[PDB]
Structure 1
Amino acid sequence: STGSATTTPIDSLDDAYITPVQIGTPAQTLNLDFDTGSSDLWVFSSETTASEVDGQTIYTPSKSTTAKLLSGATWSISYGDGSSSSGDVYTDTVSVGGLTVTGQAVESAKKVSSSFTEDSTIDGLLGLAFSTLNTVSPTQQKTFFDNAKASLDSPVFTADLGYHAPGTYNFGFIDTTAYTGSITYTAVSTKQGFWEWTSTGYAVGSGTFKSTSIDGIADTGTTLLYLPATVVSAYWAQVSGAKSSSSVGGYVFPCSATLPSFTFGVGSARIVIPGDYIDFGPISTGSSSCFGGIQSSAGIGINIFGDVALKAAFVVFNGATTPTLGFASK
């Protein structure tokens, strides 16, 4: 089998992407944030504290003939951005772009943190990291991908995120029309539960390529590109008027400035992020100071190839017995 679904930016800045997901019988369609950096499929629901729901579409398990309480199961998660959610668990039928998994753990939120409430466009998350990170207790649950894997034509999914435009998540096949050149595959460590790999280096604009190993994760659920302070400083030093602002919480720059591209290495191959992808707009409405899309990972404890990087590429998440990652230009 295969599946194919369009993913759409939630706003004009590509702060995140939402993908429609069918849950239950009859289908309840929720717009979920596909997150290769986590492993829980959780949803706003009829069980979510009323004061914490503000415009989201909710899953109502009592209206699904295929929903079953996963008796005794609870979940609780906290994300890198400080957000969190928790609740109980149902199993139900879940479909993404024509691909159906029966008995998928659907984690129903009883509580969500303010950032989730405040974002009316995201109805929940669909985790696509390794199932070892799943927070369901006492019985850890499998991701949608892990459940679908054996049925897929090939045990892979692909992320093809758009710049200020929709893109595509495919399951079970590689669309050879969706990228240029060849796909370069690179090793993955699953030891921390992430799609963790090692970039071979970077270049800033037309500058010479610096060969250096940069461990990091391929994370569709993170907006920006977070890299070591050395690398990030080298980038922003090429932008007139750029500075790191403690009050704003990262590098900012005047949008009268022109942003250089940023290149990252995948083996001997190179993915080029255009300068425009690194502009995240005014720090506040009407401000002449813009927020940068490349930021320091210092303090996070890991480098993160988030949407800024991933949307410059066609990315293969290869879930074979030995997982790997593939990157192609597009």
Structure 2
Amino acid sequence: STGSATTTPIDSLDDAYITPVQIGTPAQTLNLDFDTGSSDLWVFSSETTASEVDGQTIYTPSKSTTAKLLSGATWSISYGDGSSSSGDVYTDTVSVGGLTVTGQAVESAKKVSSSFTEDSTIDGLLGLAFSTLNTVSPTQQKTFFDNAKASLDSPVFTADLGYHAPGTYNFGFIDTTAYTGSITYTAVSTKQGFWEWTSTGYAVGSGTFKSTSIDGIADTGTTLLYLPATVVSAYWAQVSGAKSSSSVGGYVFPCSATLPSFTFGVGSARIVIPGDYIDFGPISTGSSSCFGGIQSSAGIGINIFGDVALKAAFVVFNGATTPTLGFASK
């Protein structure tokens, strides 16, 4: 089997991408944030505290003929931005782009933190990291990809995110029309439960390539590119007036600037992020200070190849027995 679904930016900044997901019978379609950096499929629901729901579409398990309470199971998760959610668990039929998993754990939120309430466009998350990170207790649950894997034509999914434009998540096949050149595959460590790999270095704009190992994770659920402070400083030093602002929480730059590209290494190959992809616009409406798309990972504890990096590439998440990541230009 295969599936293919379009993913769409939630706003003009590409802050996140949402993908329609069918849950239950008859189908209830919710727009979920596919997150290769976590492993819970959770949704706003008829159980979510009413004061914490503000415009989201909710899953109502009592209206699904295939929903079953996963008795005694609870979940609770926090994200890298400090946001969180928690609740109980149903199993139900879940379909993404024509690919169906029966008995998928659908984690129903009883509580969500303010950032989720405030984002009316995100109805929940669909985790695509390794199932060892799933937070359901006392019986840990598998991700949608893990459940589908044995049925897929090939044990892979691909992320083809757009820049200020829709893109595609495919399951079970590699669309050879979606990229240019070849896909370069690189080894993955699952030791932390992430799609963790080692970039071979970087370049700023037209500069020469710096060969240096950069461990990090491929995370579709993170907006920006978080790299070591040395690398990030070398980038922003090329932008007149750019500076790290503790009050804003990262590097800002004059909105009058044209940004250089940023290249990262994948083995002997290179992915070039255009400068425009690094512009996240005014820090507040009308400001002439703009927020940078490349930020320091210092104090996060891990480098994150988030959407800024991933949307410059066609990315293969190969979940074979020995997992790998593939990157191609597009």
Q: TM-score, normalised by structure 2?
A: 1.00
The residue that corresponds to 1:320 in the other structure is 320
The residue that corresponds to 2:195 in the other structure is 195
**Residue 100 (1) aligns with residue 100 (2):** yes
* CA drift at 1:255: 1.3
CA shift digits 1:152-204 (9 cap, x unpaired): 00000000000000000000000000000000000000000000000000000
CA shift digits 1:191-244 (9 cap, x unpaired): 000000000000000000000000000000000000000000000000011000
Partners of 1:297 and 1:313 lie apart in 2 by 21
User: Please, what is the CA RMSD of the aligned residues?
Assistant: 0.2
Partners of 1:192 and 1:141 lie apart in 2 by 17
* CA drift at 1:273: 0.0
CA shift digits 1:258-291 (9 cap, x unpaired): 1000000000000000000000000010000000
Partners of 1:189 and 1:289 lie apart in 2 by 38
* CA drift at 1:10: 0.0
* CA drift at 1:45: 0.1
Partners of 1:76 and 1:285 lie apart in 2 by 34
* CA drift at 1:15: 0.2
Unmatched runs of 5 consecutive residues or more in structure 1: none
CA shift digits 1:284-305 (9 cap, x unpaired): 1000000000000000000000
The residue that corresponds to 1:295 in the other structure is 295
Unmatched runs of 5 consecutive residues or more in structure 2: none
Partners of 1:100 and 1:209 lie apart in 2 by 44
Partners of 1:20 and 1:257 lie apart in 2 by 36
Secondary structure of the 2:271 match is: strand
* CA drift at 1:82: 0.2
**Percent identity over paired residues:** 100
Secondary structure of the 2:159 match is: strand
Partners of 1:178 and 1:94 lie apart in 2 by 26
Partners of 2:257 and 2:87 lie apart in 1 by 46
Q: TM-score, normalised by structure 1?
A: 1.00
Partners of 2:271 and 2:79 lie apart in 1 by 27
**Equivalence map 1:51-66=2 (5 Å):** 51-66=51-66
Q: What is the aligned residue count?
A: 330
Secondary structure of the 1:82 match is: coil
Partners of 1:96 and 1:307 lie apart in 2 by 20
Partners of 1:258 and 1:126 lie apart in 2 by 35
Partners of 2:258 and 2:308 lie apart in 1 by 17
Partners of 2:286 and 2:164 lie apart in 1 by 21
The residue that corresponds to 2:141 in the other structure is 141
Secondary structure of the 1:182 match is: coil
The residue that corresponds to 1:273 in the other structure is 273
CA shift digits 1:70-129 (9 cap, x unpaired): 000000000000000000000000000000000000000000000000000000000000
Partners of 1:233 and 1:214 lie apart in 2 by 15
Runs (4 or more) in structure 1 with deviation over 3 Å come to none
Partners of 2:196 and 2:211 lie apart in 1 by 19
The residue that corresponds to 2:306 in the other structure is 306
Partners of 1:224 and 1:285 lie apart in 2 by 20
The residue that corresponds to 2:234 in the other structure is 234
* CA drift at 1:16: 0.1
